[PDB]
Amino acid sequence: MIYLSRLLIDTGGNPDRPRPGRKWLDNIYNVHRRLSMAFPSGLRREQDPHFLKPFSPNDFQKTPFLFRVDNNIDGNDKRAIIIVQSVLEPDWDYCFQNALDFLAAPPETKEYNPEFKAGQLLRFRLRVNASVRRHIPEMVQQDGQTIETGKILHKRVSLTWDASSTPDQALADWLAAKSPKLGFTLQRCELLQLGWVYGSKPEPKNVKVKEQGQGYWREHKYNPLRFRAALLEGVLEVDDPKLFLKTLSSGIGKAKSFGFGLLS
Amino acid sequence: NRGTVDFIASLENLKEGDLGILRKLRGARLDEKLPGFDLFSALWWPLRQKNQRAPKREVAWLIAKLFAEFRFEQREGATLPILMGGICRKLEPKKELPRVLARFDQLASLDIMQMEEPLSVIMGILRKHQQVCLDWVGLTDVLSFWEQEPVKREWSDSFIKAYKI
Amino acid sequence: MLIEIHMIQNHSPANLNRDDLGAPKTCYFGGVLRSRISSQCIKRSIRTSNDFKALLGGVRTRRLADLIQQEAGETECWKKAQEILNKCGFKNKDDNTKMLVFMSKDKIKDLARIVLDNSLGLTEAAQQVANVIAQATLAPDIALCGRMLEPNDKDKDKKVKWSNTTVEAALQVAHAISTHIARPEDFVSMFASACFYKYFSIDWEQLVKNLKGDTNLAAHTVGAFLLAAAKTNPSGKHNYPDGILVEFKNSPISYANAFVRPVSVVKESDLVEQSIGQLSNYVNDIRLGYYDEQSPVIGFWFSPNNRYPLGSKLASRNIGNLNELVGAVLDYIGGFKWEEVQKSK
Amino acid sequence: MLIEIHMIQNHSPANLNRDDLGAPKTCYFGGVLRSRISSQCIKRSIRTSNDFKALLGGVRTRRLADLIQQETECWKKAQEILNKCGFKNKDDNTKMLVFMSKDKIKDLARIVLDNSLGLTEAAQQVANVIAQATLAPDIALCGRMLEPNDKDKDKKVKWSNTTVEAALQVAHAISTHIARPEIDYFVAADDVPGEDAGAGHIGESMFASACFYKYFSIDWEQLVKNLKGDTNLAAHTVGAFLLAAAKTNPSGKQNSFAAHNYPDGILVEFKNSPISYANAFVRPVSVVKESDLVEQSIGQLSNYVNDIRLGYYDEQSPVIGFWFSPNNRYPLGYKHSKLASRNIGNLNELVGAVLDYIGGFKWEEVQKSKA
Amino acid sequence: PSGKQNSFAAHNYPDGILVEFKNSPISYANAFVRPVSVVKESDLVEQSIGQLSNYVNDIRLGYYDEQSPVIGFWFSPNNRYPLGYKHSKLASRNIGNLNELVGAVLDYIGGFKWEEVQKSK
Amino acid sequence: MLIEIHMIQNHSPANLNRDDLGAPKTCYFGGVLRSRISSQCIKRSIRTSNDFKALLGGVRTRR
């Protein structure tokens, strides 16, 4: 059930006027938030059509889904493309119903269903994290005299590849070896984009107390999160049209919420 | 007061385009045009954090609009009921003096927002008589307290005192 | 005189200039979209290249304090140097100064030997720091890219005086444009080599004025500039240029309008040679409409072993080599054989 | 015999004129946005150009009495004399723009160094000599408002009016299509290594590319009246204006963009009443897949030029027109008729035709009257 | 007008001149109560002239058909802007040149030409 | 017998009837801001015109 579509956003052209979409694209936590309060619910849909209510994420349906932000030229106009697909029907008449400045052209819903059988030459790109659990999380190197104090911490650090090669034949080897698990293969792979992606997620806490109830009085906190990016393509030959559909429903890698998803 | 003087001095600093967009906003509230509100915020925000006494917001907006429209200069001792009355002595008491006199008394029974047009006609006949000086600080602090009748009666008695001399 | 170099190069845009949204840089030319690489990216890629290894004499840093205890040797000179720099007028938020400082990598030891002396007050120390960074322009990178320096005045001490701390740039790089239609990506050796056109201009007299009158250093700068522009892909980390037209005149002329209408060609291999055809046609009509007597214009044409030809006579000579191209640009200034010009930094 | 210049010039992506906010200057015409190259910027760009060297000399001056010593320590008494002439002092300069311009600073030097005179008569003769400088043709193309400041002296400054009724009218440069603003992103890339990714500064810059239609409106009679005769000098300044309009561009942010794009077509006319063909581009030029926008814009211009030439007829006022393209790369008579009287391929005989229609002069002897 | 023409050279010629001959005055300014919104398929001048032609034909059919008809001449330079695409033949004579419009007005006036009239002064 | 003229023009970026501040003159027509060229300015430019320099028979001077 592919629901591939597009959300063409309004990049500005004057960094003097306020630019809502450009600022919104700089934080992937809020990018996921924006993409996730779409298709909200039918629970309180009959109450209000105006999106004027105190926000709570519990009312929104907790179905995991996917997106990816990219850039393309159609024939004559640069416009950043967001490609989404989900198991629920598209209803972007409420997510952007008072934030029309976020959009450039009204979004379009397509219908698509896959068929590849085995060994064709009609495949597409991919996005993934270069995340590996560390072999040697060496004992928490602390500061003060550039020393080492701690014991251990299993962390999902960035992939430390080799030092005598480039990653268009190192990460290429990596997903070429990864492909027979997920039910496909790579005969050619050249990377297009790599780097880091950043965000910020807020943590509600509780320190203070209230004299007539429980501790409503409390403070704020923010925390950062980082990921290693890899956008790349390939001419691929699917092993079987019976297990690759699960990979087309989950994606190579499972950042999902934070951009890196399935093959497109 | 040591707060309104800075407001008047900052108003005298305003250049031609700013008071042009203030001129275009006669009779219009500070909402339907973004640049007018931006100018008013720039003029009105920073004088509350430096001195404890500031004029009322509506008085400041009305005085800024009128100042842009007429562009006088600030001089102590040139309030409205002195120059008014001084020009009333230069009149024929038969017909024109009641006309201009009623034009002046229309101000004494009006709220702050609606006085834009009567103050406009009063300052128009002031401009016709070639008046350059107007005590903007004095006008502003008698206008921010315009709702108490002692200052209205003092202003009227100032008109009487300037008329009998 | 001005050194105007026009190069037609097949640059693959997969690993090229990006914007803050990850897109390749694009510009509208002729009312229709083309592909763009930024001028500062070409300048920095030439700067940090292999051929510009000897001529990288300028450092654009924000932490002079970190550089102070690199040749001082002793340990306890880091905070006093920060205080002296702050009394100069470059404020400190952290280890780095909060304005950009561009000096040559030979006056840092001068700053260190100024700082380590403890026989004079902070005011005259900051004055001497201004004496160090107010005329330290002894760098070809400074002479080419240009710089001005002006400090904060909000709580800087009032007992300091600065010289004319600006050096005028010698380099005018155009935002290089793609002659053809930029190829679309959809909603249902692997990416094409885009025919790019780049423009570089170097002011000879102003550059040698910016290097305190030296000649062999500036000749090495211009030769290494052509070699680094031709040999280095503009990016961050052979692809030889299909055609280099290097023209000498006293006025800048841009041949971008040769490709006002895109060279819309279905065949991939039938693109670059008639892009060169369009370039030759428009250079012919610009020469016939603008360059007549007064100041004549002489230009050289290079191709990889003369593969894409030119045109009639719109250049001076055809050479299929790059070091011959350096020898052929450097002799119109008069002499300066390239085998001895590299003995400069 | 009005000198009207209509030009077509396509520009590479650049930012020539910017405001205090860094945006390229834009204007509205026909309800749609156009790129604007402001009139003062064109006047200065042609003024500060290389070819406007033999006829320059309208020097801007706000810091006065410092060049007097350059041509004794006259900072005290000559500035005191200038203050007594009305130009008051507020700092280490004169807070009044003075258009003294002409190269007769020898007269000011010799009256200032004359230590045998008082203040009033010296200031008076200064007032007649600076109100009658009348050299420097940029004065004849842009006038003055030097009427001192009457808050000084003993009120004995009976000066003469300095206004010159300048003969130049320059319209703001108009793009023939929809202006498309673009955003440039740059970083500073800290040279020494650090513990961060490294970017000493982050900023956003703008640029645009457009096909520009320009309008310079000068009349010959006021130009030669403001220049007290000297017909060859008038030919020199009109030739300098033609060459500078054809060869120079505003030098704003040109170290990073290099948009030295020379000309596509030129409309130089001579008539008795002024007209602007900006109304040709009231309809914006839309790109067709077969032709480039320069050819399209020239076609639209030719359509409207034929309109005005035929639909506004008086038999006693014949109007001619000149058309120029580089090697006839874009002829104007594509549609129906040879609109221009002569189609010219190179700039030099275009200037020659301008000289021939103005006064029959040549381009060789015109440079003798340097003045 | 001769305002800031030194720095803003906006000398332009009128692309539409309408002359009517009535014994009472009218002003066709109520046509442009709605401002002209420029569309991508046309230009501002053509749209304004179309609205003017709409109003002129409408007032002509509403405030006329007397024993005395309303006669007029319409002027566009070389006929790029005729009277819209609505009902044609509204103007008695669509004139492409200015001097011929002046001559038509003068011939309505009683039969005085343009050349010998200047001999009065 | 009334002879009426109705015209349509279109000018470039202009300052024809500026303010003493410098702002071009504006008026409201139909609730929207429109640029206005003053009737006095139109009449004076008509009077001082080149083709009105064959009709003039008055000066209307002051002194």
Side-chain angles (χ1 to χ4, degrees), chain A residues 2-138 140-241 243-264, chain B residues 1-94 96-165, chain C residues 1-52 54-98 100-157 160-206 208-211 213-290 292 295-323 325-336 338-340 342 344-345, chain D residues 1-52 54-71 73-75 77-79 81-94 96-101 103-114 116 118-150 152-155 159-224 226-288 290-313 317-335 337 339-361 363-371, chain E residues 1-39 41-63 65-88 90-121, chain F:
Chain A
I2 272 181
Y3 270 177
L4 189 182
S5 60
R6 233 146 62 185
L7 252 61
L8 273 305
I9 45 56
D10 174 64
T11 290
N14 213 322
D16 178 33
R17 315 295 187 255
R19 307 178 284 156
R22 166 84 204 82
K23 184 209 127 156
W24 154 71
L25 261 188
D26 249 350
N27 187 13
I28 55 176
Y29 185 80
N30 273 111
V31 158
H32 177 49
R33 277 221 33 80
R34 158 82 47 249
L35 274 284
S36 47
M37 75 261 279
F39 43 90
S41 106
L43 192 141
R44 81 305 155 291
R45 178 26 36 201
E46 221 74 270
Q47 312 192 319
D48 61 277
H50 290 318
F51 202 6
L52 288 212
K53 58 114 154 194
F55 162 71
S56 266
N58 292 1
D59 321 329
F60 299 89
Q61 189 181 145
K62 269 149 299 313
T63 318
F65 73 113
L66 249 68
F67 28 88
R68 178 185 76 209
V69 33
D70 200 337
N71 304 276
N72 90 9
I73 329 183
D74 299 358
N76 207 4
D77 36 357
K78 149 171 301 178
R79 223 180 309 101
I81 43 164
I82 289 194
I83 274 75
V84 324
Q85 67 280 58
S86 194
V87 310
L88 283 105
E89 81 106 30
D91 201 70
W92 331 282
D93 90 354
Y94 167 80
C95 185
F96 291 71
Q97 71 103 65
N98 41 16
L100 284 307
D101 274 289
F102 278 60
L103 211 29
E108 53 276 57
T109 285
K110 264 198 152 151
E111 191 31 74
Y112 181 51
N113 260 352
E115 163 42 33
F116 276 95
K117 64 63 199 163
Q120 325 168 350
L121 294 324
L122 207 69
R123 218 157 209 214
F124 30 86
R125 300 163 142 201
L126 177 281
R127 260 274 198 94
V128 83
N129 337 33
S131 203
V132 290
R133 281 137 172 210
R134 186 71 267 179
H135 285 335
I136 25 69
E138 50 86 22
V140 195
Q141 30 181 25
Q142 265 279 300
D143 38 6
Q145 301 80 237
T146 76
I147 40 58
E148 168 262 288
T149 73
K151 25 166 209 57
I152 203 70
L153 200 266
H154 287 184
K155 225 158 91 144
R156 239 167 147 179
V157 317
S158 41
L159 173 57
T160 306
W161 30 279
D162 79 279
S164 20
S165 330
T166 81
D168 42 332
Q169 60 305 8
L171 215 50
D173 160 1
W174 195 61
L175 65 181
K178 277 163 55 113
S179 30
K181 163 23 174 155
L182 277 280
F184 72 113
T185 187
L186 290 101
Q187 76 205 157
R188 257 174 69 96
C189 149
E190 302 73 11
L191 57 58
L192 304 197
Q193 192 153 63
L194 90 165
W196 299 77
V197 58
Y198 316 90
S200 102
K201 169 173 60 23
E203 297 317 288
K205 329 309 316 313
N206 180 27
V207 162
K208 265 67 55 170
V209 299
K210 187 76 189 49
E211 42 267 53
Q212 48 75 35
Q214 70 56 15
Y216 332 111
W217 248 112
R218 108 296 164 271
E219 66 271 308
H220 59 351
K221 202 170 319 324
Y222 291 83
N223 70 102
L225 46 55
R226 347 297 289 290
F227 313 95
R228 220 283 193 293
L231 178 132
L232 72 186
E233 58 97 13
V235 267
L236 323 178
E237 298 84 63
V238 47
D239 297 356
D240 64 90
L243 81 78
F244 99 107
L245 198 135
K246 191 172 54 59
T247 89
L248 259 304
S249 179
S250 53
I252 291 57
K254 291 146 268 138
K256 303 186 164 131
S257 33
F258 299 98
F260 314 124
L262 77 75
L263 291 131
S264 152
Chain B
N1 196 9
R2 260 282 298 110
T4 319
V5 39
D6 321 61
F7 175 68
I8 296 329
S10 293
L11 272 190
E12 278 218 309
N13 264 4
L14 274 186
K15 304 314 224 156
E16 304 56 5
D18 315 351
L19 40 77
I21 89 167
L22 274 174
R23 240 187 199 197
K24 264 182 237 282
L25 281 198
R26 165 217 289 241
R29 329 172 173 193
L30 55 152
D31 65 317
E32 82 276 317
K33 287 234 262 213
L34 200 280
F37 174 84
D38 261 349
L39 192 61
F40 184 71
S41 295
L43 251 287
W44 159 255
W45 281 352
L47 60 93
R48 340 265 317 271
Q49 225 164 331
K50 49 172 47 64
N51 272 344
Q52 293 329 104
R53 275 319 299 273
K56 259 191 287 314
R57 159 204 319 176
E58 337 200 330
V59 172
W61 173 247
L62 164 71
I63 282 302
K65 251 147 40 162
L66 285 168
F67 177 85
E69 218 147 35
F70 291 108
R71 305 161 47 41
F72 290 156
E73 67 92 349
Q74 159 70 29
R75 165 182 322 173
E76 174 33 280
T79 81
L80 245 188
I82 275 79
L83 269 58
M84 280 327 251
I87 60 60
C88 272
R89 298 185 299 62
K90 308 351 171 191
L91 261 189
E92 337 171 356
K94 246 292 118 263
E96 309 214 11
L97 195 276
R99 305 289 173 180
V100 187
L101 191 286
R103 218 59 68 94
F104 187 81
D105 325 293
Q106 202 52 327
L107 281 177
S109 189
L110 277 175
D111 322 85
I112 277 304
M113 291 258 282
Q114 302 134 12
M115 296 180 30
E116 198 181 344
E117 280 300 312
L119 271 180
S120 301
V121 307
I122 291 299
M123 252 160 282
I125 78 197
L126 277 185
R127 187 172 39 195
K128 260 210 61 46
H129 288 146
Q130 281 276 9
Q131 281 310 312
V132 169
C133 47
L134 190 289
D135 204 8
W136 291 104
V137 202
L139 180 54
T140 313
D141 68 328
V142 304
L143 267 186
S144 41
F145 292 123
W146 192 249
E147 277 286 345
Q148 25 188 336
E149 291 140 22
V151 74
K152 238 134 76 169
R153 254 174 258 134
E154 271 233 14
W155 142 302
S156 314
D157 268 275
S158 279
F159 194 101
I160 278 59
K161 183 190 325 322
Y163 201 41
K164 316 270 235 313
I165 193 42
Chain C
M1 47 195 333
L2 271 305
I3 317 293
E4 283 151 68
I5 315 158
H6 303 266
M7 303 168 1
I8 291 289
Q9 203 136 12
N10 264 328
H11 275 311
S12 274
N15 35 284
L16 272 202
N17 264 272
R18 334 235 189 217
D19 82 313
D20 49 346
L21 282 318
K25 324 207 107 188
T26 64
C27 70
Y28 274 100
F29 196 37
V32 60
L33 198 132
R34 331 268 181 131
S35 263
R36 173 183 62 115
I37 68 199
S38 86
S39 44
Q40 75 263 354
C41 198
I42 314 184
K43 286 158 143 175
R44 180 124 172 99
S45 291
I46 289 165
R47 227 188 105 192
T48 76
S49 70
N50 183 36
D51 258 306
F52 236 44
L55 288 119
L56 193 126
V59 47
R60 182 152 18 213
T61 165
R62 284 162 95 212
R63 34 206 68 161
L64 259 284
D66 266 16
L67 256 174
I68 281 307
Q69 57 285 346
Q70 303 303 100
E71 70 271 74
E74 78 102 346
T75 299
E76 290 282 331
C77 261
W78 177 54
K79 295 294 221 75
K80 207 177 90 218
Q82 171 176 310
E83 261 221 302
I84 295 174
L85 283 189
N86 199 297
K87 210 141 153 59
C88 213
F90 312 128
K91 310 303 226 213
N92 44 259
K93 165 73 163 305
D94 214 357
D95 199 8
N96 49 357
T97 62
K98 162 285 218 183
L100 259 303
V101 190
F102 197 5
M103 327 148 53
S104 149
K105 267 302 226 323
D106 325 69
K107 311 304 202 303
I108 276 61
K109 56 182 211 335
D110 188 19
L111 266 201
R113 68 137 309 278
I114 278 283
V115 160
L116 61 92
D117 198 358
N118 229 320
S119 72
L120 84 84
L122 300 195
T123 298
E124 251 319 301
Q127 164 60 227
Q128 286 143 45
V129 164
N131 302 142
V132 170
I133 335 157
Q135 72 270 359
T137 82
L138 204 30
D141 188 20
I142 288 272
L144 256 271
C145 282
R147 151 185 155 260
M148 84 297 189
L149 196 40
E150 37 92 26
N152 203 347
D153 226 309
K154 64 154 304 309
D155 58 84
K156 167 198 78 47
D157 157 31
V160 292
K161 163 23 56 173
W162 261 277
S163 322
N164 169 341
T165 87
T166 172
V167 286
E168 316 71 326
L171 191 50
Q172 306 188 283
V173 174
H175 284 235
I177 56 178
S178 71
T179 86
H180 58 84
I181 274 300
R183 298 103 186 306
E185 87 294 337
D186 47 290
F187 210 45
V188 187
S189 62
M190 207 60 135
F191 280 160
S193 36
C195 181
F196 266 109
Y197 160 77
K198 341 166 192 175
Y199 182 46
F200 312 121
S201 195
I202 294 186
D203 351 324
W204 191 231
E205 286 97 12
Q206 189 261 30
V208 305
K209 169 63 38 43
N210 259 20
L211 256 200
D214 205 356
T215 316
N216 69 95
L217 233 157
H220 193 24
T221 319
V222 58
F225 187 80
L226 202 171
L227 223 44
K231 224 198 278 284
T232 61
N233 324 121
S235 63
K237 176 135 191 184
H238 42 90
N239 317 69
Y240 252 58
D242 295 298
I244 290 188
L245 162 78
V246 36
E247 259 182 345
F248 309 140
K249 28 201 152 200
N250 283 38
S251 148
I253 305 184
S254 178
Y255 298 145
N257 276 345
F259 326 103
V260 164
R261 42 183 302 95
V263 195
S264 98
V265 168
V266 188
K267 301 50 57 184
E268 292 335 272
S269 145
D270 209 351
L271 155 77
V272 47
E273 71 302 298
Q274 79 199 133
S275 291
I276 285 151
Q278 272 200 1
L279 185 269
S280 59
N281 270 352
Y282 174 118
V283 164
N284 200 34
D285 55 60
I286 284 288
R287 189 80 32 92
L288 282 191
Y290 281 115
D292 264 353
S295 46
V297 32
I298 302 307
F300 308 122
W301 180 243
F302 144 86
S303 325
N305 49 61
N306 306 312
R307 180 257 209 71
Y308 308 106
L310 207 33
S312 72
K313 200 251 189 196
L314 72 101
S316 151
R317 94 189 66 185
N318 230 306
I319 32 192
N321 163 304
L322 224 48
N323 60 44
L325 181 54
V326 180
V329 50
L330 195 37
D331 69 343
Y332 223 148
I333 313 122
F336 333 107
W338 202 62
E339 72 278 2
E340 84 260 3
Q342 327 93 321
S344 294
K345 205 58 198 207
Chain D
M1 212 79 33
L2 259 75
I3 340 162
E4 316 234 324
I5 320 189
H6 308 273
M7 300 192 21
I8 295 292
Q9 167 172 350
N10 185 43
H11 261 321
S12 168
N15 190 357
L16 304 108
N17 290 166
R18 37 158 154 160
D19 46 358
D20 35 28
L21 290 119
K25 299 191 134 132
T26 45
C27 78
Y28 269 75
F29 179 73
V32 282
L33 188 99
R34 325 285 184 127
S35 290
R36 219 189 61 238
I37 300 305
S38 283
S39 49
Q40 52 267 10
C41 313
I42 311 183
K43 295 147 145 223
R44 263 257 190 141
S45 93
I46 72 95
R47 187 241 289 264
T48 36
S49 82
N50 152 268
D51 61 0
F52 216 166
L55 304 197
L56 181 53
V59 278
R60 214 42 172 251
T61 333
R62 141 185 271 201
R63 297 141 181 78
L64 286 105
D66 22 65
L67 173 286
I68 294 179
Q69 174 51 105
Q70 290 159 49
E71 141 80 11
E73 209 270 318
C74 306
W75 184 89
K77 227 214 193 307
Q79 166 234 43
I81 282 175
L82 276 194
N83 263 57
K84 293 306 131 279
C85 210
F87 326 111
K88 88 271 192 184
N89 204 104
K90 257 67 184 285
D91 197 335
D92 206 6
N93 44 73
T94 286
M96 257 288 102
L97 307 97
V98 171
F99 260 32
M100 74 162 147
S101 84
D103 296 315
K104 296 181 334 315
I105 202 71
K106 290 266 309 170
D107 299 27
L108 250 66
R110 64 105 196 184
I111 62 100
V112 157
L113 80 96
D114 193 11
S116 51
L119 291 208
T120 297
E121 67 313 345
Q124 273 330 87
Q125 57 82 15
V126 136
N128 326 71
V129 76
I130 69 145
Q132 267 84 73
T134 196
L135 314 179
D138 202 0
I139 295 312
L141 310 209
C142 288
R144 315 179 206 211
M145 306 264 130
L146 198 48
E147 289 81 54
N149 192 344
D150 258 336
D152 213 314
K153 215 27 167 50
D154 44 339
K155 310 306 186 214
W159 70 75
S160 19
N161 201 5
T162 318
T163 318
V164 86
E165 54 108 8
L168 171 162
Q169 315 167 347
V170 164
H172 285 216
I174 271 291
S175 84
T176 76
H177 55 101
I178 290 264
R180 302 224 186 80
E182 298 255 29
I183 291 199
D184 174 41
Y185 192 92
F186 67 96
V187 312
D190 226 350
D191 215 341
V192 292
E195 63 106 338
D196 283 15
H201 196 53
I202 305 290
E204 303 198 51
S205 172
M206 320 252 267
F207 61 99
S209 175
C211 183
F212 275 120
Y213 163 60
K214 296 146 124 69
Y215 187 34
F216 309 95
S217 314
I218 327 188
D219 62 324
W220 195 36
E221 295 331 284
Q222 287 173 335
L223 181 119
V224 299
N226 291 19
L227 290 167
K228 64 204 110 48
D230 308 64
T231 90
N232 303 353
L233 180 273
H236 204 314
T237 173
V238 72
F241 214 103
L242 184 44
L243 272 274
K247 253 46 163 303
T248 207
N249 292 320
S251 322
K253 237 169 178 39
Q254 296 266 307
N255 282 352
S256 339
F257 288 109
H260 296 92
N261 312 109
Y262 279 174
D264 307 322
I266 280 210
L267 213 36
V268 172
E269 310 146 6
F270 293 111
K271 64 209 307 152
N272 294 346
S273 152
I275 36 69
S276 99
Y277 309 133
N279 267 0
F281 313 114
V282 160
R283 173 149 207 76
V285 168
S286 220
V287 267
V288 48
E290 81 71 20
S291 202
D292 53 317
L293 93 167
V294 164
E295 180 78 85
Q296 265 195 260
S297 287
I298 276 157
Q300 273 214 18
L301 175 74
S302 296
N303 160 0
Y304 181 116
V305 163
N306 195 230
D307 254 17
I308 288 326
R309 290 320 189 93
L310 263 40
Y312 279 85
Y313 207 101
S317 57
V319 183
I320 35 66
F322 290 166
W323 186 247
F324 165 78
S325 261
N327 205 21
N328 324 342
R329 217 194 177 243
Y330 297 102
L332 91 171
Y334 202 18
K335 178 65 221 74
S337 19
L339 267 78
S341 64
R342 33 183 318 185
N343 279 17
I344 303 331
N346 179 246
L347 257 187
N348 305 278
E349 61 286 44
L350 181 84
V351 193
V354 152
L355 296 162
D356 163 57
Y357 208 90
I358 277 296
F361 322 120
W363 197 237
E364 189 38 70
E365 102 287 335
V366 70
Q367 319 288 341
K368 304 174 175 164
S369 83
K370 298 252 155 274
Chain E
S2 171
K4 203 146 60 200
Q5 300 285 271
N6 262 26
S7 179
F8 297 91
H11 308 294
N12 266 123
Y13 272 16
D15 36 43
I17 297 186
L18 165 89
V19 178
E20 292 194 351
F21 297 86
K22 328 174 48 158
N23 283 292
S24 269
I26 49 56
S27 212
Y28 297 129
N30 297 337
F32 314 112
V33 177
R34 62 161 327 115
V36 178
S37 302
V38 201
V39 289
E41 304 56 5
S42 88
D43 41 313
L44 175 85
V45 152
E46 198 216 9
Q47 255 204 87
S48 88
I49 285 170
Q51 280 184 11
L52 168 68
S53 85
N54 193 304
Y55 203 62
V56 161
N57 171 252
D58 201 293
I59 288 296
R60 198 85 62 80
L61 295 185
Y63 283 117
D65 322 82
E66 306 330 275
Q67 79 300 319
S68 45
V70 179
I71 321 95
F73 320 102
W74 159 262
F75 172 49
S76 323
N78 212 49
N79 286 299
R80 236 180 61 159
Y81 314 109
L83 274 206
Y85 284 145
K86 226 201 82 174
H87 275 135
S88 100
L90 167 71
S92 287
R93 277 241 316 290
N94 279 0
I95 311 188
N97 196 25
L98 178 57
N99 269 317
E100 325 322 287
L101 171 96
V102 179
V105 175
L106 286 194
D107 261 40
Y108 192 124
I109 274 301
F112 315 127
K113 304 325 74 176
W114 179 240
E115 49 298 1
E116 93 289 333
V117 153
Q118 333 272 15
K119 314 299 167 187
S120 47
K121 183 114 157 119
Chain F
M1 162 90 153
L2 299 197
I3 322 293
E4 308 133 44
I5 325 174
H6 302 69
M7 317 168 32
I8 294 275
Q9 306 205 0
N10 184 86
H11 297 125
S12 307
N15 218 346
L16 310 150
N17 221 264
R18 82 160 81 78
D19 229 324
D20 272 7
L21 311 181
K25 221 159 175 181
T26 56
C27 68
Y28 280 67
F29 184 36
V32 288
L33 184 103
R34 327 239 181 175
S35 293
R36 185 172 39 93
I37 303 184
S38 185
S39 270
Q40 318 127 244
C41 168
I42 303 177
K43 287 228 274 296
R44 175 114 200 281
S45 53
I46 281 157
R47 283 186 249 155
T48 302
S49 299
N50 249 33
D51 49 333
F52 253 67
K53 209 162 38 42
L55 173 140
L56 64 181
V59 158
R60 195 192 149 168
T61 194
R62 165 68 51 97
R63 22 75 179 188

